[PDB]
Design a protein around this ligand. Structure first.
Ligand SMILES: Nc1ccn([C@H]2C[C@H](O)[C@@H](COP(=O)(O)OP(=O)(O)OP(=O)(O)O)O2)c(=O)n1
Ligand SMILES: Nc1ccn([C@H]2C[C@H](O)[C@@H](COP(=O)(O)OP(=O)(O)OP(=O)(O)O)O2)c(=O)n1
Ligand SMILES: [Cl-]
Ligand SMILES: [Cl-]
Ligand SMILES: [Cl-]
Ligand SMILES: [Cl-]
Ligand SMILES: [Cl-]
Ligand SMILES: [Mn+2]
Ligand SMILES: [Mn+2]
Ligand SMILES: [Mn+2]
Ligand SMILES: [Mn+2]
Ligand SMILES: [Mn+2]
Ligand SMILES: [Mn+2]
Ligand code: NA
Ligand code: NA
Length: 326
DNA sequence: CCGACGCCGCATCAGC
DNA sequence: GCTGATGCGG
DNA sequence: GTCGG
């Protein structure tokens, strides 16, 4: 964390552009800068040194010189003082409340935790649970807990059908010592790109995990994606573990490698890797890598038998999960 | 200068 | 009910 | 906000 100050500043500026400005390319540009800088192995001494890094331009170079000189950025100190931006920024911390709803709420005079609690009736279901577990979701998860959760999820899934396979991805799979939540990839022989030979596949699982009281709430749910909440069982007399976010994603067993690549991330690594795909004339999603015809129209799925195969196509050497934390 | 900027599932709305 | 646009978070 | 072209 050589340049933690700079990257925090950029992160806050990113958050501002997303939540208040609703300027999603500014959001992403700052996030990119922040990530590149974050990986850089020297304590930055100037804007010009930063500006040697792809993603950092003049505007960010200026901001970094202002920061390294004073320890602050006047532009941030301002936004912090703006009640509206401050309120929009806070409200967006609730899962389900984006920039739009946030601006909505602040417009009706809803702009604090207390205001939200007294107005549950004005929140959709997702927003309701985000609020319910607000504090809980702020907490991080130590790996040792992720290892316990992993154990419960996996064995409960074997109890449903021995042919289910479940791979924990996200930061956990990247070897992080703490995760902000749990991401589960789920595959079953009876579900491939060529057929859905069984319905309920995901439901069957969410139910088992509900039966055993692991999963406690649901934010959203369709045939292949479940978004909700879970909680480790706590021993006799011990205070309960916090409530955690969980995501479960069912994908075609034959498309696992693109899936496992996708859900491992990081989000920024995926944006970076996919953009270099377009530059190299391919397109990648959670299901396939496919070539881009002269027109820009995608072609048929290329054969993939490994995470490595995917890197090959777009001429990148293989990067371990642990080295994908961007 | 210019246009592009990763790509997708589910919830909710508008319009028919 | 459907279908598409939009929000929201992955 | 940045960068390839
Ligand atoms: N949720 C999962 C997880 C794994 N597999 C599969 C496809 C693979 O070919 C294989 C791999 O076994 P591993 O558990 O060791 O997972 P890896 O993908 O890392 O191994 P490999 O790259 O050798 O396939 O089992 C699957 O179908 N669904
Ligand atoms: N804009 C995004 C956000 C997320 N993801 C992906 C890659 C991620 O790694 C995964 C999980 O999303 P998370 O928000 O859970 O991110 P992480 O697991 O990487 O981090 P955290 O430790 O906070 O959970 O899905 C993505 O493709 N694009
Ligand atoms: Cl923008
Ligand atoms: Cl500051
Ligand atoms: Cl796993
Ligand atoms: Cl596809
Ligand atoms: Cl690794
Ligand atoms: Mn995660
Ligand atoms: Mn998170
Ligand atoms: Mn997640
Ligand atoms: Mn709780
Ligand atoms: Mn571009
Ligand atoms: Mn240029
Ligand atoms: Na640069
Ligand atoms: Na939010």
């Amino acid at each position: 964390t050589l340049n933690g100050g700079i990257t925090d500043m950029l992160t806050e500026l990113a958050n501002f552009e997303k939540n208040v400005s609703q300027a999603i390319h500014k959001y992403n540009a700052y996030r990119k800068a922040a990530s590149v800088i974050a990986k850089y192995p020297h304590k930055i001494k100037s804007g010009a040194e930063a500006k040697k890094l792809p993603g950092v331009g003049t505007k960010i170079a200026e901001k970094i010189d202002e920061f390294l000189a004073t320890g602050k950025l006047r532009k941030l100190e301002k936004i912090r003082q703006d009640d509206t931006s401050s309120s929009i920024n806070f409200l967006t911390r609730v899962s389900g409340i984006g920039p739009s709803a946030a601006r909505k709420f602040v417009d009706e005079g809803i702009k604090t935790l207390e205001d939200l609690r007294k107005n549950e009736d004005k929140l959709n279901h997702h927003q309701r649970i985000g609020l319910k577990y607000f504090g809980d979701f702020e907490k991080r998860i130590p790996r040792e807990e992720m290892l316990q959760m992993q154990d419960i999820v996996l064995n409960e899934v074997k109890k449903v059908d021995s042919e289910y396979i479940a791979t924990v991805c996200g930061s956990f799979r990247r070897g992080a010592e703490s995760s902000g939540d749990m991401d589960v990839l789920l595959t079953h022989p009876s579900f491939t790109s060529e057929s859905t030979k069984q319905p309920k596949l995901l439901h069957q699982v969410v139910e088992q995990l509900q039966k055993v009281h692991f999963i406690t709430d649901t934010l959203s749910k369709g045939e292949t994606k479940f978004m909700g909440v879970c909680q480790l069982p706590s021993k006799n007399d011990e205070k309960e573990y916090p409530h955690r976010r969980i995501d479960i994603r069912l994908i075609p067993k034959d498309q696992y490698y693109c899936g496992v690549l996708a859900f491992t991330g990081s989000d920024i690594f995926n944006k970076n890797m996919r953009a270099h795909a377009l530059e190299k004339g391919f397109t990648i999603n959670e299901y396939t890598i496919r070539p881009l015809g002269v027109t820009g129209v995608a072609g048929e799925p290329l054969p993939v038998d490994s995470e490595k195969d995917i890197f090959d196509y777009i001429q990148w050497k293989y990067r371990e999960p642990k080295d994908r934390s961007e």
